[PDB]
């Protein structure tokens, strides 16, 4: 060791597992001082690091003991080289029809427990066919071993064929058997194939309507049924039902592959056909990208941003549009952070004619203007009235009973469809804002809130009916979205401390705080903890009867409400385990206040659980503040945490 | 009737064509006119029927599969309330070999052609009857386990998943609260079959949510627990799955794995399989130990060739994390909590939480391998310093009522201070030459290892486990506690009483003094 031949020195503990004269705890040291050779640097000492750990680990195997840490640390990359360097240690050092059962088993058993920890089945093979662990353990685990694994990772083989049992006796049979494989099709080629001879065979009959399940648009079906030649309006029929079908079931390659066939089918006789179907094309790239390509925020290829553009400044009358189109634009300029053309190089006409780019000009115009302290105000205000006309009544009438009758450029249904494709969390916080602003008019605590203004006109037309629909909606949308999001948790709760739905409020306050903390492992932050929120979580436990947890839930407040605390403490309609509970108090005040509650009322056992609370050298109030301190937050992490498994 | 009479064989062959000319009529009728759909009272009887001609669908005899899986795909475009997720899920949660699950997706596809999301609903329709008295936990399990092959058969895609674009994995990843509580399931079966679907079972692709998360670990760790009881060894592996991938999820999803794996485990059940006290074998513990440190490594080692014999750094937060919850379990007042070592003579204040921490140590021999686990990230092994002075102390208290001339009649304490020796030395909290004062442990009357004990307290004094004295090695990714930087750092007044302990019994001593070198 002090000349650095560390060979011989492994060599030395493989011989030495058959004698075990060296001490154990010298090998220890010496593989900790190995260890802390190779971490300082000598890269080349790891792997004499794990030689010699290796020669531990199977003389302690031999000497019955445990397997140590560094040994499946070792062992998170498994290696030919570093298990055969064990293995054969393994072998060397067990000395075979001399060990006795002893040595056998437990050398047979750790063989056995390092074929289990290996992730690849190939190196537990290896292992398997080592020579020692043949001879080690038994004629018949083996095999047990490893049919038992290969289960572990089974291959599975699914027939993706539907059945067919195509026995062509009569034209009829043929017919029907050429439909089931037309409308089992996927591929645009082979439909393409199918509907020629399908038209070859018969004389004057259509194909397109063999399966009701193909569905078109019927904005595009009297452009589509206008072909003078049957077999292209049958083949670009099936081919747009098919891409649509495979679009909805998130068959994107074949979707694709079925739409650049019928696009390149229809530019030589149509132009109109051949627009309507670049829109059509678009949009599949856009949910496709959203799909597939996005699903973990990176930015568009820069192509779609331009066909999007492209579309959204197209002003082509003749052509049908689809609404859903420019929605599903609008959406993903939106969700890319697009700001700056919606704000400034969006066309004028465009807002004017469609209210989806008018109101997405107007969500990032209020989004971009946030750290402006009065800029973002101007966009904000308008924003604001937007909404609520969207939601207001002009003249029994209900807005989600009519859904017409509306001041706004949109109707409720068709915002929150719009709303429902943002995944960007800016905007979607901006409309949570402006939702729950117009929620509390005529609380909940909802992040930017003073930038829309308190005072509206016409107060009585809001239907605010759909306007809390809406609100409900877009939360558990929100949590949906980001199940981690505290600030999104701590609303939820709110809500339901306001329906009363207090078990539900604790609940989702105790998500805000495994949010802001993790788990409540950390302090909570006072921001979403805030005396508000503790002490709504008080007022749900108080009004779930849940007493002894409002007491301690009092004491989570920068101040301890001590009124609330006692008030709930001298409840005894508790569903809160009163006396389990009275750890988590830190307040020396509440603990004397709970034995004199308990002293005055006879209950002679609690009166002694409360004093032994009290009489802790950690709860003492002469402690130097810093006792004190840490148990109080333990304390609301080990209450917090209860409460977590009590409610989630 | 005419099924089994396709199989006088002009009346058989009459059968056969007459089947052949059914199924393609009743093709036509069921999807045509694409204006009401066609009505067949044929297969408005055959919705009250579908799970029967499923059944003989899934005998998958001769031609019977291939005319009835026609004809189940027929009925399920008929049917208005389309039967074919309720026919996917009945083959689900009836199918027993992967050809009888291969009639499933052939039943997709030729329903994914004309009808969308068949698969999840055909999940919940089994999982609503699974949880319910409905689909009796043997369905249950199969259904658990068919819906598992199908995740991983997407999962190892190929040309069917891509094809088929069932997106298995995908639709069974909304589906993990109800797996959690079928963790939770008395049928070993299930609670297994969903541990596995659970383990390989994609999770949410935003988040997992607090309630989420937890009930998922919840439910993992408890599947770990009963089946490390129940199977042993071999028996984790979905469990630790789940929970390793509900640990990938977060930091959060990290910590909350293993903290619920530490309660369990440090919980007075689930104590038999670790060697804790209140005869078990001693293989059987040392190889669940094995286990839940396989586990715990590899949820602790930071995911992601560093040559072919290195190992992956253990994260020091994780590591740290381990550090915490060790001490809440084992001193939980935690009344001198900082971490720098307060003077030798407060010991003597605190004799009940040190002795409580020692009577736990013995109780439960598997804290001294956490130890290990929190020293092997450097800067963990800090946050343990409670714990280390504690049974330091208690050590000490014990050598003081030592009257034996020697140490081998104190085997629990002479080994305790041993281990607590090499766990400070190994999380570099001592000296190397400070460091290898254990082995001559054994080789000493009780009050020369109570001085020795008592220079580890002094230098763990003048030093302090501090999280701050170790310095980030960015080379290698792991923090490096420079003695020599520290001043004094080799033991300089603290090697004094082990050299003149040596002097005093170099009759014995004398080949060991290579261990206690300067450099």
Redesign the interface.
């Given at each position: 060791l002090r000349s650095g031949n560390y060979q011989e020195v492994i060599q030395i503990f493989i011989e030495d597992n058959l004698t075990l004269s060296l001490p154990v705890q010298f090998r220890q040291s010496v593989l900790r001082e190995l260890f802390k050779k190779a971490q300082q640097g000598n890269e080349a000492l790891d792997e004499i690091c794990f030689k010699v750990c290796a020669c531990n680990t199977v003389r302690d195997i031999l000497e019955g003991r445990t397997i140590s840490v560094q040994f499946n640390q070792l062992f998170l990359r498994p290696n030919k080289e570093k298990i055969d360097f064990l293995l054969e240690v393994c072998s060397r050092s067990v000395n075979l029809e001399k060990a006795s059962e002893s040595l056998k088993g437990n050398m047979a058993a750790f063989l056995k427990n390092v074929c289990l920890g290996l992730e690849d089945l190939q190196y537990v093979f290896m292992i398997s066919s080592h020579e020692l662990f043949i001879t080690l353990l038994k004629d018949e685990e083996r095999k047990l071993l490893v049919d038992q694994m290969r289960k572990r990772s089974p291959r599975v083989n699914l027939c993706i064929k539907p059945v067919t049992s195509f026995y062509p006796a009569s034209a009829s049979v043929n017919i029907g058997q050429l439909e089931h494989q037309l409308i089992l099709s996927v591929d645009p080629w082979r439909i393409r194939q199918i509907l020629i001879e399908l038209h070859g065979m018969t004389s004057e009959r259509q194909f397109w309507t063999v399966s009701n399940k193909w569905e078109v648009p019927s904005v595009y079906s009297g452009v589509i049924l206008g072909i003078k030649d049957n077999l292209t309006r049958d083949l670009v029929y099936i081919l747009m039902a098919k891409g649509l079908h495979c679009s909805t079931v998130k068959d994107f390659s074949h979707a694709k592959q079925l739409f650049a066939a019928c696009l390149e089918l229809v530019t030589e006789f149509s132009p109109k056909l051949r627009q309507v179907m670049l829109n059509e094309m678009l949009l599949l790239d856009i949910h496709t990208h959203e799909a597939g390509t996005g699903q973990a925020g990176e930015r568009p290829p820069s192509d779609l941003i331009s066909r999007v553009r492209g579309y959204l400044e197209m002003r082509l009358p003749d052509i049908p549009l689809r609404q859903v189109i420019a929605e599903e634009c609008v959406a993903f300029m939106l969700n890319w952070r697009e700001n700056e053309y919606l704000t400034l190089q969006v066309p004028a006409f465009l807002l004017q004619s469609n209210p989806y780019v008018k109101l997405g000009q107007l969500l990032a115009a209020t989004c971009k203007e946030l750290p402006g302290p009065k800029e973002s105000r101007r966009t904000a205000k308008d924003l604001w009235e937007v909404v609520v006309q969207i939601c207001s009544v002009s003249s029994r009438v209900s807005l989600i009973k009519q859904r017409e009758s509306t001041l706004g450029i949109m109707y409720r249904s068709e915002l929150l469809s719009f709303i429902k494709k943002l995944r960007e969390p800016l905007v979607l916080t901006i409309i949570l804002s402006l939702f729950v602003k117009l929620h509390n008019v005529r609380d909940i605590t909802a992040e930017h809130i003073s930038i829309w203004p308190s005072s509206i006109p016409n107060l009585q037309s809001v239907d605010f009916e759909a306007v809390a629909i809406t609100v409900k909606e877009l939360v558990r949308y929100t949590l949906s979205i980001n199940p981690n999001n505290h600030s999104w948790l701590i609303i939820q709760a709110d809500i339901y401390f306001a329906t009363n739905q207090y078990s539900a409020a604790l609940h989702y306050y105790l998500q805000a705080g495994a949010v802001c903390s993790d788990f409540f492992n950390k302090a909570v932050p006072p921001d979403v903890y805030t005396d508000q929120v503790i002490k709504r979580m008080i007022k749900c436990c108080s009004l779930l009867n849940c007493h002894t947890q409002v007491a301690i839930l009092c004491q989570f407040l920068r101040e301890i409400d001590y009124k609330t605390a006692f008030k709930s403490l001298q409840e005894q309609n508790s569903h809160d385990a009163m006396d389990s509970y009275y750890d988590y108090i830190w307040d020396v005040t509440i603990l004397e206040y709970l034995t004199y509650l308990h002293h005055k009322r006879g209950e002679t056992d609690k009166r002694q659980i409360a004093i032994k609370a009290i009489g802790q050298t950690e709860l003492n109030a002469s402690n130097p503040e810093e006792v004190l301190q840490l148990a109080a937050q333990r304390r609301k992490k080990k209450f917090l945490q209860a409460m977590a498994k009590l409610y989630f | 009737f005419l099924v089994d009479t396709a199989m006088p064989d002009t009346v058989r062959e009459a059968c056969?064509?007459l089947?052949?000319?059914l199924?393609?009529?009743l093709?036509?009728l069921v999807?045509?006119?694409?204006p009401p759909?066609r009505l067949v009272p044929f297969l408005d009887a055959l919705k009250n029927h579908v799970g029967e001609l499923c059944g003989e669908t899934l005998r998958l005899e001769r031609?019977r599969?291939?005319?009835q899986?026609?004809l189940l795909?027929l009925l399920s475009?008929y049917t208005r309330p389309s039967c074919g997720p309720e026919a996917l899920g009945h083959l689900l949660s009836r199918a027993r070999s992967?050809?009888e699950?291969?009639?499933?997706?052939?039943?997709y596809?030729?329903?994914?052609?004309?009808?969308?999301?068949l698969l999840p609903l055909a999940f919940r329709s089994c999982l609503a009857r699974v949880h319910a008295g409905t689909l009796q936990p043997p369905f249950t399990a199969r259904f658990l386990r068919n819906l598992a092959?199908?995740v991983?058969?997407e999962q190892?895609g190929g040309?069917?998943?891509?094809?088929?674009?069932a997106?298995f994995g995908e639709s069974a990843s909304a589906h993990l609260s109800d797996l959690a509580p079928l963790l939770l399931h008395p049928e070993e079966e299930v609670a297994e079959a969903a541990a596995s679907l659970l383990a390989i079972c994609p999770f949410?692709?935003?988040?997992?949510?607090?309630?989420?998360?937890?009930?998922l670990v919840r439910a993992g760790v408890h599947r770990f627990f009963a089946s490390l009881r129940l199977h042993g060894?071999?028996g984790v592996?979905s469990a630790c799955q789940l929970l390793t991938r509900l640990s990938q999820t977060?930091?959060?999803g990290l910590?909350?794995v293993l903290?619920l794996l530490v309660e369990g485990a440090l919980h007075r059940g689930n104590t038999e399989l670790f060697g804790g006290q209140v005869s078990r074998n001693?293989?059987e513990v040392?190889?669940n130990?094995?286990?839940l440190?396989?586990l715990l490594?590899?949820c602790c080692?930071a995911p992601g060739?560093?040559?072919?014999?290195?190992?992956?750094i253990?994260s020091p937060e994780a590591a740290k994390?381990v550090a915490v919850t060790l001490v809440?379990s084992v001193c939980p007042?935690?009344?001198g909590?900082?971490l720098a070592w307060p003077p030798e003579e407060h010991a003597r204040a605190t004799v009940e939480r040190d002795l409580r921490i020692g009577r736990r140590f013995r109780e439960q021999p598997l804290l001294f391998?956490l130890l290990?686990?929190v020293a092997?990230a450097p800067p963990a092994l800090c946050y343990c310093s409670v714990l280390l002075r504690g049974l330091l102390a208690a050590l000490l208290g014990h050598w003081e009522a030592s009257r034996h001339p020697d140490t081998t009649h104190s085997p629990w304490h002479l080994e305790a201070s041993?281990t607590l020796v090499?766990v400070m030395?190994?999380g570099?909290l001592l000296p190397?030459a400070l460091?290898?004062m254990?082995?001559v442990f054994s080789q000493l009357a009780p009050f020369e290892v109570r001085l020795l004990l008592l220079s580890v307290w002094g230098f763990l004094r003048e030093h302090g486990p501090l999280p701050q004295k170790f310095i980030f090695?960015s080379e290698?990714g792991?923090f490096?506690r420079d003695f020599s930087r520290e001043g004094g750092g080799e033991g300089g007044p603290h090697l004094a009483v082990l050299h003149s302990v040596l002097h005093r019994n170099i009759d014995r001593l004398g080949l060991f003094s290579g261990?206690f070198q300067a450099p």
């Amino acid at each position: 060791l002090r000349s650095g031949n560390y060979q011989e020195v492994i060599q030395i503990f493989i011989e030495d597992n058959l004698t075990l004269s060296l001490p154990v705890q010298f090998r220890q040291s010496v593989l900790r001082e190995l260890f802390k050779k190779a971490q300082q640097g000598n890269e080349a000492l790891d792997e004499i690091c794990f030689k010699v750990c290796a020669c531990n680990t199977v003389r302690d195997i031999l000497e019955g003991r445990t397997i140590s840490v560094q040994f499946n640390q070792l062992f998170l990359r498994p290696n030919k080289e570093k298990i055969d360097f064990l293995l054969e240690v393994c072998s060397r050092s067990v000395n075979l029809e001399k060990a006795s059962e002893s040595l056998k088993g437990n050398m047979a058993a750790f063989l056995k427990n390092v074929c289990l920890g290996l992730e690849d089945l190939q190196y537990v093979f290896m292992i398997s066919s080592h020579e020692l662990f043949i001879t080690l353990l038994k004629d018949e685990e083996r095999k047990l071993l490893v049919d038992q694994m290969r289960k572990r990772s089974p291959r599975v083989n699914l027939c993706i064929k539907p059945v067919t049992s195509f026995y062509p006796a009569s034209a009829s049979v043929n017919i029907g058997q050429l439909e089931h494989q037309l409308i089992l099709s996927v591929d645009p080629w082979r439909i393409r194939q199918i509907l020629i001879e399908l038209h070859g065979m018969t004389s004057e009959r259509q194909f397109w309507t063999v399966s009701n399940k193909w569905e078109v648009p019927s904005v595009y079906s009297g452009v589509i049924l206008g072909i003078k030649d049957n077999l292209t309006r049958d083949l670009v029929y099936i081919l747009m039902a098919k891409g649509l079908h495979c679009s909805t079931v998130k068959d994107f390659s074949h979707a694709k592959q079925l739409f650049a066939a019928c696009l390149e089918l229809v530019t030589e006789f149509s132009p109109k056909l051949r627009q309507v179907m670049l829109n059509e094309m678009l949009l599949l790239d856009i949910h496709t990208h959203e799909a597939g390509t996005g699903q973990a925020g990176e930015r568009p290829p820069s192509d779609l941003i331009s066909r999007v553009r492209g579309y959204l400044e197209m002003r082509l009358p003749d052509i049908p549009l689809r609404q859903v189109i420019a929605e599903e634009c609008v959406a993903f300029m939106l969700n890319w952070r697009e700001n700056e053309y919606l704000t400034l190089q969006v066309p004028a006409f465009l807002l004017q004619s469609n209210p989806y780019v008018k109101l997405g000009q107007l969500l990032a115009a209020t989004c971009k203007e946030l750290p402006g302290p009065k800029e973002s105000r101007r966009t904000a205000k308008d924003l604001w009235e937007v909404v609520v006309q969207i939601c207001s009544v002009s003249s029994r009438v209900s807005l989600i009973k009519q859904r017409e009758s509306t001041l706004g450029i949109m109707y409720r249904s068709e915002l929150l469809s719009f709303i429902k494709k943002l995944r960007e969390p800016l905007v979607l916080t901006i409309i949570l804002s402006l939702f729950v602003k117009l929620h509390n008019v005529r609380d909940i605590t909802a992040e930017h809130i003073s930038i829309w203004p308190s005072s509206i006109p016409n107060l009585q037309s809001v239907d605010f009916e759909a306007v809390a629909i809406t609100v409900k909606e877009l939360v558990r949308y929100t949590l949906s979205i980001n199940p981690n999001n505290h600030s999104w948790l701590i609303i939820q709760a709110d809500i339901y401390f306001a329906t009363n739905q207090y078990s539900a409020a604790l609940h989702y306050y105790l998500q805000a705080g495994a949010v802001c903390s993790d788990f409540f492992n950390k302090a909570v932050p006072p921001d979403v903890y805030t005396d508000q929120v503790i002490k709504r979580m008080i007022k749900c436990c108080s009004l779930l009867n849940c007493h002894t947890q409002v007491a301690i839930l009092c004491q989570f407040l920068r101040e301890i409400d001590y009124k609330t605390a006692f008030k709930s403490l001298q409840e005894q309609n508790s569903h809160d385990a009163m006396d389990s509970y009275y750890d988590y108090i830190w307040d020396v005040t509440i603990l004397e206040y709970l034995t004199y509650l308990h002293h005055k009322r006879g209950e002679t056992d609690k009166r002694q659980i409360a004093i032994k609370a009290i009489g802790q050298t950690e709860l003492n109030a002469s402690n130097p503040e810093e006792v004190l301190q840490l148990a109080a937050q333990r304390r609301k992490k080990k209450f917090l945490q209860a409460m977590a498994k009590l409610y989630f | 009737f005419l099924v089994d009479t396709a199989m006088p064989d002009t009346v058989r062959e009459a059968c056969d064509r007459l089947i052949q000319l059914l199924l393609l009529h009743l093709q036509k009728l069921v999807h045509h006119r694409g204006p009401p759909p066609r009505l067949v009272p044929f297969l408005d009887a055959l919705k009250n029927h579908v799970g029967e001609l499923c059944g003989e669908t899934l005998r998958l005899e001769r031609k019977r599969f291939l005319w009835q899986h026609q004809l189940l795909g027929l009925l399920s475009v008929y049917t208005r309330p389309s039967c074919g997720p309720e026919a996917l899920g009945h083959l689900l949660s009836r199918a027993r070999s992967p050809e009888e699950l291969s009639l499933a997706t052939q039943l997709y596809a030729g329903l994914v052609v004309s009808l969308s999301g068949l698969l999840p609903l055909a999940f919940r329709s089994c999982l609503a009857r699974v949880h319910a008295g409905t689909l009796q936990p043997p369905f249950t399990a199969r259904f658990l386990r068919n819906l598992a092959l199908l995740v991983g058969w997407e999962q190892q895609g190929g040309e069917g998943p891509a094809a088929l674009g069932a997106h298995f994995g995908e639709s069974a990843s909304a589906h993990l609260s109800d797996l959690a509580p079928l963790l939770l399931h008395p049928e070993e079966e299930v609670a297994e079959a969903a541990a596995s679907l659970l383990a390989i079972c994609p999770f949410p692709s935003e988040a997992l949510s607090p309630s989420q998360l937890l009930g998922l670990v919840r439910a993992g760790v408890h599947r770990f627990f009963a089946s490390l009881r129940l199977h042993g060894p071999p028996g984790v592996a979905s469990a630790c799955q789940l929970l390793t991938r509900l640990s990938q999820t977060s930091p959060a999803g990290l910590k909350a794995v293993l903290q619920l794996l530490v309660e369990g485990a440090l919980h007075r059940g689930n104590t038999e399989l670790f060697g804790g006290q209140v005869s078990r074998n001693q293989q059987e513990v040392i190889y669940n130990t094995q286990s839940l440190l396989s586990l715990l490594v590899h949820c602790c080692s930071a995911p992601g060739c560093g040559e072919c014999w290195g190992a992956p750094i253990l994260s020091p937060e994780a590591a740290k994390a381990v550090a915490v919850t060790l001490v809440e379990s084992v001193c939980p007042d935690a009344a001198g909590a900082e971490l720098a070592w307060p003077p030798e003579e407060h010991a003597r204040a605190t004799v009940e939480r040190d002795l409580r921490i020692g009577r736990r140590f013995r109780e439960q021999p598997l804290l001294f391998e956490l130890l290990k686990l929190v020293a092997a990230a450097p800067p963990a092994l800090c946050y343990c310093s409670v714990l280390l002075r504690g049974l330091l102390a208690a050590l000490l208290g014990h050598w003081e009522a030592s009257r034996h001339p020697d140490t081998t009649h104190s085997p629990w304490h002479l080994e305790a201070s041993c281990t607590l020796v090499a766990v400070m030395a190994e999380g570099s909290l001592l000296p190397p030459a400070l460091g290898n004062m254990h082995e001559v442990f054994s080789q000493l009357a009780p009050f020369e290892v109570r001085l020795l004990l008592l220079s580890v307290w002094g230098f763990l004094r003048e030093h302090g486990p501090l999280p701050q004295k170790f310095i980030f090695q960015s080379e290698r990714g792991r923090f490096i506690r420079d003695f020599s930087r520290e001043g004094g750092g080799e033991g300089g007044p603290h090697l004094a009483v082990l050299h003149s302990v040596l002097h005093r019994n170099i009759d014995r001593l004398g080949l060991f003094s290579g261990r206690f070198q300067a450099p």
